[PDB]
Amino acid sequence: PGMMDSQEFS
Amino acid sequence: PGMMDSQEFS
Amino acid sequence: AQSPATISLPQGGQFRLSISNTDPNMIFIPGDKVTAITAPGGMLADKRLTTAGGVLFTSVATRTFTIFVETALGQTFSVVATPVKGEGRVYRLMSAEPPSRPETRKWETAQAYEKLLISLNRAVLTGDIPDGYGEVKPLSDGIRLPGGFSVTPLKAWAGDQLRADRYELRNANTWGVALREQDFWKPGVRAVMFDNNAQTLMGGGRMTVTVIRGNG
Amino acid sequence: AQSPATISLPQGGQFRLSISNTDPNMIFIPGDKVTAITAPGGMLADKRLTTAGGVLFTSVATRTFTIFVETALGQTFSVVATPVKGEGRVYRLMSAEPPSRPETRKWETAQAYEKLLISLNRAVLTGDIPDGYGEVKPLSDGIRLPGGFSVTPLKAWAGDQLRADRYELRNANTWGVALREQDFWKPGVRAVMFDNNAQTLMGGGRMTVTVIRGNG
Amino acid sequence: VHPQRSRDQIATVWIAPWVDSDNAFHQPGRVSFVVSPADWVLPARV
Amino acid sequence: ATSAVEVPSASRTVHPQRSRDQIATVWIAPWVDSDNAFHQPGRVSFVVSPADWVLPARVN
Amino acid sequence: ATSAVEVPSASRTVHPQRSRDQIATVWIAPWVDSDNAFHQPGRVSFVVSPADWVLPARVN
Amino acid sequence: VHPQRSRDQIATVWIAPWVDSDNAFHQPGRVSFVVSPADWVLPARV
């Protein structure tokens, strides 16, 4: 209900 | 009924 | 868009702010990197430590709590949040008391003294701050006022020795006066530099000065 | 913003303060690392060590109790908590007398050129001749004369750098004047000393100077 | 018509009294240095 | 690594400044490159000595 | 590791005190650092001999 | 205008009569020592 959308490229 | 909450860090 | 909202926060201070329950927020510290955050009381959703040195979080509660953000150089602050509607926000932290960096101690004691002052002075003039020097809150009233002048601090850099500042001198008077470099001395200042090599102002307040204090 | 509440305790004192049950509360001793704790009567829940060295906690009880706290150096303390509604707070603990170490390491080294000038110049005054210096014929009139004076060469040293000298001053006039040692400069002088420390003239010439020079 | 130079830029520091590491009290002084060394001015008229 | 240079002061408060530069121009006679490329080079101007610190003999 | 030094008493009750210090000042002629940094050093003052124990020739 | 020193600090002990470890009565005496050695006074006016 509150989590994020975090990503790292290379 | 009377014990303590003793802790040591590192 | 906007400049980040800047605050003072001495070691372990409190500041009242507001955060958004949507729209994840960010708190970051210049000159350091946040390595811990523990904010119970309202049970924030999640925390994520970026690579710049900030911390990302988001709350879903509806009441005021406290947040304890902790740095790597033994700095600990505290911000009292309050969830609101939207438009996630970014704040900046600014330790009013410089921390201790022993790497900077050995770097500073490695070289001489006058060449060290020259290094710091040119790094302030050009812009390339050395590696190991943070950025701490500019201290007011660190210089004398010989006559009617209006000082206004701009920025400060400091670590472990010889904290460096930046000010501005303005002639509030009507005529031109003599600017002798030793007037703006105090018990604790180590150097004074006038940025533009002007022997006498005109009446307009566009003159800055750099002061290299100590015990930073 | 707000400064931490600062207090002073003796060795093993017991201070009356207030904490908040929610909103974890922090206690830290500046300069030390908290090692232990013993917080009974309230049976509080969270107990973790930050990076600064202080300890923070989260009470849950509803009455006034006692919490003890220890230090890496043995400086024990005691605080009588009292839970309240909210808005957790941060305090600071320090002792008054026991912290006292004004010892200062003498930082601020000098240049490589000035230290050797001062060393040779000091050895020309005490008398002990440094290894690597002999003796030479006094160079003729190698120093200027500011008016009604005279020069009476005595002797000089030399070798491998800094051919030092020693000349003599004689007030050939009748009254007393001032002295500024930038008048004796000659094209090649490295340093000029006045031995008999005087800032005014008298008529009697018995003081010497030590003029250092290159090609020695 | 000759290609001239550009005038230099300097800044003179003022060193407040400090005590040496060999216990010698150094009184106030000045040290000067150059920031932007001179380079040829590029003409705008030929 | 010898003794540093001195700056002789003037003879009887102004901060120091450097000394003006001097320039030398050379006129190159036209030549022909090794790859048959006829050149008409212009007057090349080069710096011959760097500036040196000096004290102004102002009204000190 | 020889005999310790003596303190010659005066000649015809006050506790001892040390003797006053003396200071020597040097005027360094302006130089130019190896990295092109013109210096205007001030008068450096250094101690030349440490204080020594002495008895005051007071009214003893 | 010259940079002066600071005056020293001393304390003189009074040694009460004591018999030695090789039987020799030492009578009352005094021994003096320095506590805070002199260092340059940092000027407050320039």
Numbering used by the authors:
A (entry chain Y), B (entry chain d): 177 to 186
C (entry chain Z), D (entry chain a): 24 to 239
E (entry chain c), H (entry chain h): 158 to 203
F (entry chain W), G (entry chain b): 69 to 80, 157 to 204
Paper passage:
Here, we present the structure of an outer-membrane core complex from the iconic F-T4SS encoded by the E. coli pED208 plasmid solved by single-particle cryo-electron microscopy at 3.3 Å resolution. This 2.1 MDa structure, provides an atomic model of the TraB, TraK and TraV proteins and unveils unique stoichiometry relationships between the three proteins. Surprisingly, the complex is formed by two highly flexible concentric rings made by a total of 69 proteins chains arranged in two distinct symmetries. The components that make up this complex include the proteins TraB, TraK and TraV which are homologous to VirB10, VirB9 and VirB7 respectively and are observed throughout the multi-functional T4SS spectrum.
For the outer ring, thirteen ASUOR heteropentamers made of TraK1, TraK2, TraV1CTD, TraV2CTD and TraBCTD(177-186) (labelled −6 to +6 in the clockwise direction) assemble to form the complete OMCCOR. Unexpectedly, the ASUOR segment of the map revealed densities to build and refine more than one molecule of TraK and TraV. Indeed, densities to fit two NTD and CTD domains of TraK (TraK1 and TraK2) were identified. Similarly, densities corresponding to two TraVCTD (TraV1CTD and TraV2CTD) were also observed in the ASUOR segment. The TraKNTD is made up of nine β strands (β1 – β9) in two sheets making a β sandwich domain arrangement. Two such domains from the respective TraK chains (TraK1 and TraK2) are present in a front-to-back arrangement and extensive salt bridge, hydrogen bond and hydrophobic interactions stabilise their interaction. The TraKCTD is made of two α helices (α1 and α2) and six β strands (β10 – β15). The two TraK CTDs are arranged with TraK1 on top of TraK2 and are related by a P2 symmetry. These two TraK CTDs are held together by two anti-parallel TraV chains that wraps the stem of the TraK linkers (α1 – TraK2 and α2 – TraK1). TraV has four β strands per chain making two continuous β-sheets with TraV1 and TraV2 that stabilise the entire OMCCOR complex. TraB also extends into the outer ring with a short stretch of sequence (residues 177–186) at the N-terminal end of the CTD.
